[PDB]
Amino acid sequence: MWSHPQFEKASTGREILEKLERREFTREVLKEALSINDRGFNEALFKLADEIRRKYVGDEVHIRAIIEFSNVCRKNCLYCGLRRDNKNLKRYRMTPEEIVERARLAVQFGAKTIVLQSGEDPYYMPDVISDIVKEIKKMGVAVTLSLGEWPREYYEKWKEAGADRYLLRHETANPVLHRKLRPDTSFENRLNCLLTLKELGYETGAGSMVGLPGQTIDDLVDDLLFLKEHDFDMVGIGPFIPHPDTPLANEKKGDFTLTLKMVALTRILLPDSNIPATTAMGTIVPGGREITLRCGANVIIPNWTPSPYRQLYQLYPGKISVFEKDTASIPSVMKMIELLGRKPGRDWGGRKRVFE
């Protein structure tokens, strides 16, 4: 019959940016934004996200000092170096005293939030965690937990102990892919944990990997819409990095640009959310965290795990620099912040509601 030509790419690209600026976040708009492979479009997207960042979360880059206190995990996620079937990794557990005193040292170096992260290690759950949380809360700082999926009763105990925030990335909002990559659990379980945490009054963090095997652009759009639906306080996003001692060893690595676009779109969708420049972004590209901080991120998470454990928390290859002294990360990120013309957080850096 009659013809159906495409609009010119330049004019399409400009209309998408205009729709984002007017906050018309249709599925087709988000899909096209993630599908365009044009450096000028991408740069404009990043500039929009940076503008939104400046307006609604300002110039503070919040520093969260993480202690990865055990690499023992009862789960078997296909992507993760810590999966239980990986026997080519030395496992470790830190004592409560080691954890508490290491947190105290971060606080003295100026960290206003301590993040405690581990594999799903039953040793500590729930009472050892509670005791550690109570001790760190006496230091005058925020406490964030990232311990995986546990019963409501454990989450309730940890909140009573004084925990402020919980990070539980949704990983992938595609339920079919979620079950294939995380064969012990389900997207439904993961979402129920996130809903429970919010109900209990935690500030909650979700987020996802970009470039997982079997994940499409339509799946990434579903990730963005899920994030928007829940108005998450925090969103952690990074590229999938294949680990050699996992079933996903020979799969494609996630793409840096596409991941940066996911960060920028997250900022645009959730203007006053706390969004880190993740270590995975710094792993895949030299200076990756600094780039991400100019594309909508406003949080950085220096690695505060001590030797000799630090080098064993091998979620993905390249994660830990072996040349670094284990107290170098906090000063390092402070210098990075200074060089970007930003400033460290003044207070605990809790999510505020200033948009709308």
Ligand SMILES: Nc1ncnc2c1ncn2[C@@H]1O[C@H](CSCC[C@H](N)C(=O)O)[C@@H](O)[C@H]1O
């Ligand atoms: N191969 C890989 N590439 C990139 N990020 C990875 C990865 N393996 C794991 N991660 C990320 O590292 C995060 C921490 S795992 C530790 C916390 C807890 N076990 C949990 O699963 O929530 C995960 O949420 C995941 O998104």
Ligand code: SF4
């Ligand atoms: S992602 Fe978290 S739950 Fe899954 S294997 Fe790794 S440490 Fe365990």
Ligand SMILES: [Cl-]
């Ligand atoms: Cl945090």
Ligand SMILES: [Cl-]
């Ligand atoms: Cl994160």
Ligand SMILES: [Cl-]
């Ligand atoms: Cl990361």
Ligand SMILES: [Cl-]
């Ligand atoms: Cl670091």
